[PDB]
């Protein structure tokens, strides 16, 4: 047994889906999320946990990611359908922080080739680190469609400064069996990153993009 | 309270198990100590019984019933002249009152196997090597 049993989640998720699928018909997509709270836990004193796992299927394929990389990766990413940006156009963009301020905003994530290490910090500024989006490595043998599927599906848990975190673990328009599975994999992944496991969580809110933010515990 | 061990400066001279001074308990009750002191005070009488009457944090208070073995009202009156027998001299000093039989453990059953016919007598019997003429 845990603090959460899949039965209680099964009954919250049903009317959570029944609201979005039946009642309110908005002209755009609806996304289900997970929000977590932390209690008796102090970011300044304690250890800032950091974890991510490969979620089985992507919660939202409608997010824009830019392919930093060398000639080989840009060549196989320009044919993929993902915006592949070179290394020699960034060469003197460091002149102005505004030139890269828009770069971080438009792309929901960044992944770069293994030559990112020497370059991406110093070629750019520290904005990407500040923004919470730092490029993740991709190898020459790693199929780039594999990473852009993986990096799009993975959820990252990070204790940055505040006791509240939130990862997105689905879109509404899936069948309900995989929704209860993934909402249940993400909660006990989150507790596994804590000192006392379930004894540090004090808030678990699951919901959909626009409506009834159900509390769980 | 407890019976502090009356060794000078707490220095017991022996093994660590016997190094205790403070958390040691007297094997007789305070009611038996009360009976001892009253019987010594009134050595011409025989302690019959005692009971609790009161207590505060420092003292427990008891009342002792004593019988006069010389009074002719007690020497006659068959229901009580057993106490005039010499065998009942200082029965409270030998643990023969109710509190003394309780502290000696004198009761029936398996819970009192150590102390039924007196524990030192039980120990002597259990620790006696009995040899017969035609050895068994």
């Amino acid at each position: 047994m845990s603090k959460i049993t899949s039965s209680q989640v099964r009954e919250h998720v049903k009317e959570l889906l029944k609201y979005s699928n039946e009642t309110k018909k908005r002209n755009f997509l609806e996304t289900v999320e997970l929000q977590v709270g932390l209690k008796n836990y102090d970011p300044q004193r304690d250890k800032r946990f950091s974890g991510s796992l490969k979620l089985p299927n992507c919660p939202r394929p409608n997010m824009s990611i830019c392919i930093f990389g060398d000639a080989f990766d840009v060549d196989r990413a320009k044919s993929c359908g993902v915006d592949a940006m070179s290394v020699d156009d960034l060469k003197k963009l460091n002149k102005n922080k505004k030139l890269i301020k828009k770069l971080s905003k438009k792309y929901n994530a960044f992944i770069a080739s293994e030559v990112l290490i020497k370059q991406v910090p110093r070629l750019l500024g520290p904005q990407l680190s500040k923004a919470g989006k730092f490029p993740t490595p991709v190898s020459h043998n790693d199929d780039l469609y594999g990473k852009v599927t993986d990096v799009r599906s993975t959820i990252k848990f990070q204790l940055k400064k505040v006791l509240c975190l939130a990862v997105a673990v689905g879109n509404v328009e899936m069948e309900e069996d995989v929704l209860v599975n993934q909402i249940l994999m993400s909660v006990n992944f989150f507790v596994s990153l804590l000192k006392k496991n379930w004894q540090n969580v004090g808030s678990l809110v699951v919901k959909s993009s626009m409506g009834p933010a159900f509390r769980l515990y | 309270g407890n019976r502090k061990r009356p060794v000078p400066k707490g220095a017991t001279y022996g093994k660590p198990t016997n190094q205790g001074v403070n958390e040691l308990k007297y094997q007789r009750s305070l009611r038996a100590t009360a009976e001892e002191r009253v019987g010594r005070r009134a050595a011409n009488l025989r302690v019959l019984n005692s009971y609790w009457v009161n207590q505060d944090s420092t003292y427990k208070y008891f009342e002792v019933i004593l019988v006069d073995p010389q009074h002719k009202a007690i020497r006659r009156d068959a229901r009580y002249n057993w106490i005039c027998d010499p065998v009942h001299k200082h029965r409270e000093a030998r643990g023969l009152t109710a509190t003394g039989k309780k502290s000696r453990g004198i009761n029936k059953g398996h819970k009192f196997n150590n102390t039924k016919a007196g524990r030192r007598k039980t120990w002597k019997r259990q620790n006696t090597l009995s040899l017969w003429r035609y050895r068994k």
């Binding site: - | 002597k124 620790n127 006696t128 090597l129 009995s130 040899l131 017969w132 003429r133």
Partner: protein, 49 residues
């Protein structure tokens, strides 16, 4: 010490046991005494059995 193929013995003689040895030399005397007590009691309570 432990030596040879011999059974493990459990002779409980590590106390002052020689102070509590009872030898029943008085077996014959106490049997005579018991018969004497029975005879005197029979005489006292006669003819009760």
């Amino acid at each position: 010490a432990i030596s040879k193929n011999l059974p493990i013995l459990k002779n409980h003689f590590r106390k002052h046991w020689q102070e509590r040895v009872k030898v029943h030399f008085d077996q014959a005397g106490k049997k005579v005494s018991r018969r004497n007590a029975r005879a005197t009691r029979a005489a006292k309570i006669a003819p009760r059995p």
